[PDB]
């Protein structure tokens, strides 16, 4: 998978506190480029990366209209889900949706996605064929029958194979200086004694893009999978990401440990020692 485009919607009911909030964000790879929040003073689809800003009024109006229509539909879907699960109108619930396309180096569709969750649990997903559905429970089977009857998968397929890929390719061109640039990690090892008998070696990766990275510690060339503390990859706030991996080592054995770093921006994997 060379590149992806994803849209993520979250629709959150809040009985007694007005209509369900609807927030949408769009990404190319690990770069956000639009968002919409039904709670904003003036809700519209709004730019979040500089390469999208050049799109004209017709683009922004069309995306805004879509997000408004989508907020209305997901408010109805929250009402329907309540009936499908025998639930009360007093509780707050959430529907999430993800969809998008992955394209290879030559820009052709690698695969399409459209998945839904209710209260954080899988609800229904368009299969990789872009033709059939997988429903997680007997409620989602109801939706599946409706969507089968209405040939919904066909509409998603036409989007995923058409506009999704064509607009992704456009964005990748317009944003080529950043979207098509990998920044390799700046790496180092730090050493933190914990007692006379043990020390922590922490292998750092900083300032990298995209987020995907592998950090692994070996002792005498053997992966320390079960003994490595890995933190979740985290945003630095300047588009780049950070991660570390740490091992507790016997004092005097630090040189038996090597940190290994793989990232798309590196011509070859890195090996660090303290």
């Amino acid at each position: 998978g060379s590149h992806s485009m994803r849209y993520f919607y979250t629709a959150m009911s809040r009985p007694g506190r007005g209509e369900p909030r609807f927030i949408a964000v769009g990404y190319v790879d690990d770069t956000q480029f639009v968002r919409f929040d039904s709670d904003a003073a003036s809700p519209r689809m709004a730019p979040r990366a500089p390469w999208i800003e050049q799109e004209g009024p017709e683009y922004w109006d069309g995306e805004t209209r879509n997000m408004k229509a989508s907020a209305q539909t997901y408010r109805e879907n929250l009402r329907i889900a309540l009936r499908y699960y025998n639930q009360s109108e007093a509780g707050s619930h959430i529907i999430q949706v993800m969809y998008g396309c992955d394209v290879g180096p030559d820009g052709r569709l690698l695969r399409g996605h459209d998945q839904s969750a209710y209260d954080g649990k899988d609800y229904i997903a368009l299969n990789e064929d872009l033709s059939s559905w997988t429903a997680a429970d007997t409620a989602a089977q109801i939706i599946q029958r409706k969507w089968e009857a209405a040939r919904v998968a066909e509409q998603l397929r036409a989007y995923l194979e058409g506009l999704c890929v064509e607009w992704l390719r456009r964005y990748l061109e317009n944003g080529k200086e950043t979207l098509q640039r990998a920044d390799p990690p700046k790496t180092h090892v730090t050493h933190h004694p914990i007692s006379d008998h043990e020390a922590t070696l922490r292998c750092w990766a900083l300032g990298f893009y995209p987020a995907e990275i592998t950090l692994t510690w070996q002792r005498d060339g053997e992966d320390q999978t079960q003994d490595t503390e890995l933190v979740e990859t985290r945003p630095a706030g300047d588009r780049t990401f950070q991660k570390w991996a740490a091992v507790v080592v016997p004092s005097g054995e630090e040189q038996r440990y090597t940190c290994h770093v793989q990232h798309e921006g590196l011509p070859k994997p890195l090996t660090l020692r303290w």
Partner: peptide, 11 residues
């Protein structure tokens, strides 16, 4: 560009 069907699918 987001998915923008004639009729947005309902559950």
């Amino acid at each position: 560009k987001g998915f923008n069907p004639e009729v947005i699918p309902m559950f």
